Design a protein around this nucleic acid. Structure first.
Lengths: 63, 191, 70, 64, 75, 141, 52, 142
RNA sequence: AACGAGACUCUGGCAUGCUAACUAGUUACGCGACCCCCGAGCGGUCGGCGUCCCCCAACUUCUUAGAGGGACAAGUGGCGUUCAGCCACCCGAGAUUGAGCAAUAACAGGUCUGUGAUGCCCUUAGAUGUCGGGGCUGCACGCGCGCUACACUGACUGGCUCAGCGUGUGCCUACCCUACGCCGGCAGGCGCGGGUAACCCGUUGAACCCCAUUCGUGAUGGGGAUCGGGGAUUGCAAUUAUUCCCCAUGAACGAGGAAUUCCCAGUAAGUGCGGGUCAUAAGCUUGCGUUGAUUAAGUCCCUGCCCUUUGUACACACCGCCCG
């Protein structure tokens, strides 16, 4: 594969999970549409990454 | 089975593999039968993916070399239809059983390699993969017919079909079985 | 000549499948789909691969002209 | 050597060796007794669960 | 290249052997007739065409670049 | 049948024979001095080349909507070896094809039809399909 | 490079024009009315007398 | 069959009966393969058999159809020579006369002493060609 | 904290969803016309094959181009500090299709012959600024990039059958792309017509490929160098042969020493076409399709590059320095 997520993703991912904690599922598609609506995302492809990491954080935080 | 595909004339059942070390690297009858040896194919992008495509297809692929026969895979299938035809008439065996024997008898079992020590040539004998045996064995017998028809009245079809008889038998009157034992003769020495 | 043969084969195969899914029933085409995909040869999907562009400094899309030192 | 040809199968692959990575070390079980095991050097690209065809088992290897 | 020469016309012995090679041979191509006799390949081409008109040999496959012939299908 | 339903390599070799049997065609003087296309290195192996080319001409008129002397040449042109120089495409002769089409037209199996260009006569279209079924009747497609 | 020297490199430039057409059938007066209004950017327009 | 004869002599060059008729004839200079497949068809004989299978009656006609080509209606453009130059006619030249004709035109171009004959006599290329990297052979280097 | 990296832009692979089409198609009949019994049948009738006919018909799968959607290591199983991630697998089009853009610092690198960018120096009427005609192509050698070959997995002669990127007169001082008809073996000439271009050339009916004849292992018909004679076209002019055509002439070469180049998937290789230069002309270069493999899934051995530690008499930096 290759590819480790950049700092722009991991930095903003933390903010977005913190303040809208109770607005996340554990599904990709729901968490995608939420990020588009609660905040500006300057691209679509960038959104699809940041959502997926926000999802991955939300799995562990309930443990 | 009630829809069993031939080659348009040849059974893909009654085909034996006489090794347990080379079965499931020969592909000929699990469901690998087809009427032609032409496909789009996937032979790449994963290492274990070459062994999943037919032996007959592999044969067509490996005999199209020398810079003027590349991109002429269709001409190559012409040579294969005559080859099997001649093999079946000539001895009487189903000509796929011929090919499988020819592969099994021609594969080298030990080979040498290089090692740098003290600034002088030393050699080491090593073994071989089953996947290596198949790749080598397909190359070697095809080299014979390619060489033979390079200034002869005999056509490439005739040469290739002759070479599979002498390979399938233990005769040792072929370009393949000669060179097979040459390699092993080295491997004994620098063992 | 070659690529046309694969196109017409792929179309008539797919035609048959679609026809049964739409005017007959699901279980009609489900059998037939299973038969084809067993000996799959891109009989229900399209090959992605297409030619890659030539970029300068060599013939072809990946080969390079000879380079001589001295 | 001139003793009957042996057959032995992979239990585990270890790593690649040689002076260009051309050789592959592998551990093999003798396939006539699993308490017997030797390490070998093999030229080809081996995988897991494959069977080889050794012409001897007098030799014992561990690197080249 | 080598020096070799082939016969471009028929003789007695060529014709007689031509009749008797048939039941003994499974494969008969013009190339094999070139070797077993000393005869040109185009001469040998037409020589086999003659035999097929008698029904001594049987055609089994045909191509632009090759022609194959078999015995009498008696084994 | 339609000529499409039968083999076409076989079709022409029988259509040529039909014409030569019936005393048909008017044949040029030049027939043993003719290269038969620019890119060719040698004269025809066959003396019946006029009959042969008229077969292939009439077949194409059935298929495509028919076009002039230029298009007929374009169908026939192939590759020209240039020795040391690398190959090129070229288009063969004209005056041979212009006599072919005019000889067919003499029997009124072709005609200069609408929008200035040859088209095959309805009588012509009749005769093609007439022997087209004879091919399928004969051997068996 | 101005004046050849160094590795041979080139550069693909492209301009893409775009064409598109709207067919109307109406009186030519009201056409020239609606045409001339609500156009600000650099975009060309071509009016045609009649069509079949 | 047909054991009657083989290698023979015709005008100025020995022609084998081993080879096919058209290709056999080409050995004679001034006759290429293209020139022979015409002349055989004007003579109305097979080209599908060997040259040793021709009879004396037949080959006697061949040379007549060859050496009077205009009178057997082979076109003028299809000849070697059209208006030779200073001889006034269309001509067809064959083996030993070809060389004699050829040597004349060399001599002529040194008679007038054009650029041509000088290049001939010096042993250098007549036509527009570079000689800087061509010819070689050679030896003697610095 | 910043720059470079990625992000971004362009390009390719996925939509029977959306938007709408006589300069794009399809389907449906209506058909009437042609055609053959070609198929059921009989030849009628029904059906098949394409063209004209088609519509104020129906539609937008195919072609076109816009907005959107889709892909995330997302899911599952291993492995990892259980972190960052990695491997396999499911689903499906696998997160990686290819380019563009590209940092700090540097070189006494290239270009005063692109510049009416430019310093200084030089020359300037017997001119370094204009016409005529000649040369840059001159050959004992040497070297580099390529092209065509050494044949039968071929050549030759007939027959069959498939594309894509473009381009085009109306511009500079003068010029385009060409259908069609006629004449000529060919090169070509001649008479008419269309195209400012999804409209016309052009449904670009290209090559290798494919099928059947002929040649027969022979420096052979392989090879087409060299060279003789003749015909056309461009230009004011073709001599040192501009280019093209016809017939003749018929060389080296029988697979390549020491060395060495390039390449991992529609990739190598085979094979043709368009653009650029262009009065006339690609063996060049730049793009485009078609046919389409083998072999690897690695390593630091060689060549070279990045990071740490260490040694130094080196800093013009080992192409260094220095001894008798």
């Amino acid at each position: 594969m290759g590819r480790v997520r950049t700092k722009t993703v991991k930095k903003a991912a933390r903010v977005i999970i913190e303040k809208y904690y109770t607005r996340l599922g554990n599904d990709f598609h729901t968490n995608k549409r939420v990020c588009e609506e609660i905040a500006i995302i300057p691209s679509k492809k960038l959104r699809n990454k940041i959502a997926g990491y926000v999802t991955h954080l939300m799995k562990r935080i309930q443990r | 089975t009630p829809d069993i595909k031939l080659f348009g004339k040849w059974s893909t059942d009654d085909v034996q593999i006489n090794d347990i070390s080379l079965q499931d690297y020969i592909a000929v009858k699990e469901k690998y039968a087809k009427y032609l040896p032409h496909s789009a194919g996937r032979y790449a992008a994963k290492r274990f993916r070459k062994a999943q495509c037919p032996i007959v297809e592999r044969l067509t692929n490996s005999m199209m070399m020398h810079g003027r026969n590349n991109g002429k895979k269709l001409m190559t299938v012409r040579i294969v239809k005559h080859a099997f035809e001649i093999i079946h008439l000539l001895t009487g065996e189903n000509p796929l059983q011929v090919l499988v024997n020819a592969i099994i008898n021609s594969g080298p079992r030990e080979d040498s390699t290089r090692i740098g020590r003290a600034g002088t040539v030393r050699r080491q004998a090593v073994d071989v993969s089953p996947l290596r045996r198949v790749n080598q064995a397909i190359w070697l017998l095809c080299t014979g017919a390619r060489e033979a028809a390079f200034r002869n009245i005999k056509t490439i079809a005739e040469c290739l079909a002759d070479e599979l008889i002498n390979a399938a038998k233990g005769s040792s009157n072929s370009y393949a079985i000669k060179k097979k034992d040459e390699l092993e003769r080295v491997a004994k020495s620098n063992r | 000549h070659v690529a046309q043969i694969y196109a017409i084969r792929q179309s008539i195969s797919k035609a048959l499948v679609a026809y049964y899914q739409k005017y007959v029933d699901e279980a009609s085409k489900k059998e037939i789909k299973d038969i084809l995909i067993q000996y799959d040869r891109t009989l229900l999907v399209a090959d992605p691969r297409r030619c890659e562009s030539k970029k300068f400094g060599g013939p072809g899309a990946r080969a390079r002209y000879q380079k001589s030192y001295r | 050597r001139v003793q009957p040809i042996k057959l032995a199968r992979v239990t585990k692959v270890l790593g690649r060796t040689g002076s260009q990575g051309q050789c592959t070390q592998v551990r093999v079980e003798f396939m006539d007794d699993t308490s017997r095991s030797i390490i070998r050097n093999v030229k080809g690209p081996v995988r897991e669960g494959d069977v080889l065809t050794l012409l001897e088992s007098e030799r014992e290897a561990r690197r080249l | 290249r080598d020096k070799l020469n082939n016969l471009v016309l028929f003789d007695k012995a060529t014709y007689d052997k031509l009749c008797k090679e048939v039941p003994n041979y499974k494969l008969i191509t013009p190339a094999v007739v070139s070797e077993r006799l000393k005869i040109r390949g185009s001469l040998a081409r037409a020589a086999l065409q003659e035999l097929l008109s008698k029904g001594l040999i049987k055609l089994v496959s045909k191509h632009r670049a090759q022609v194959i012939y078999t015995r009498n299908t008696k084994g | 049948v339609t000529v499409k339903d039968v083999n076409q390599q076989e079709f022409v070799r029988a259509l040529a024979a039909f014409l030569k049997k019936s005393g048909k065609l008017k044949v040029p003087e030049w027939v043993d001095t003719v290269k038969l296309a620019k890119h060719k290195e040698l004269a025809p192996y066959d003396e019946n080349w006029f009959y042969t080319r008229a077969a292939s001409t009439a077949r194409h008129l059935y298929l495509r909507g028919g076009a002039g002397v230029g298009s007929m040449t374009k169908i026939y042109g192939g590759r020209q070896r240039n020795g040391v120089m690398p190959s090129h495409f070229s288009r063969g002769s004209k005056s041979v094809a212009r006599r072919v089409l005019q000889a067919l037209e003499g029997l009124k199996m072709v005609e200069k039809d609408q929008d200035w260009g040859r088209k095959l006569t309805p009588q012509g279209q009749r005769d093609l399909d007439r022997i087209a079924g004879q091919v399928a009747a004969a051997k068996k497609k | 490079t101005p004046c050849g020297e160094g590795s041979k490199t080139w550069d693909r430039f492209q301009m893409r024009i775009h064409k598109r057409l709207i067919d109307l059938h109406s009186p030519s007066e009201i056409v020239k009315q609606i045409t001339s209004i609500s156009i600000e950017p650099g975009v060309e327009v071509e009016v045609t007398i009649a069509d079949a | 069959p047909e054991k009657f004869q083989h290698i023979l002599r015709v005008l100025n060059t020995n022609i084998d009966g081993r080879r096919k008729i058209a290709f056999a004839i080409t050995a004679i200079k001034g006759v290429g393969r293209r020139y022979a497949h015409v002349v055989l068809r004007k003579a109305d004989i097979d080209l599908t058999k060997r040259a040793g299978e021709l009879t004396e009656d037949e080959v006697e006609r061949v040379i007549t159809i060859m050496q009077n080509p205009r009178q057997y209606k082979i076109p003028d453009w299809f000849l070697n020579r059209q208006k030779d130059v200073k001889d006034g006619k269309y001509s067809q030249v064959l083996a030993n006369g070809l060389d004699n004709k050829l040597r004349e035109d060399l001599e002529r171009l040194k008679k007038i002493r054009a650029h041509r004959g000088l290049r001939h006599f010096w042993g250098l290329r007549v036509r527009g060609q570079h000689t800087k990297t061509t010819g070689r052979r050679g030896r003697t280097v610095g």
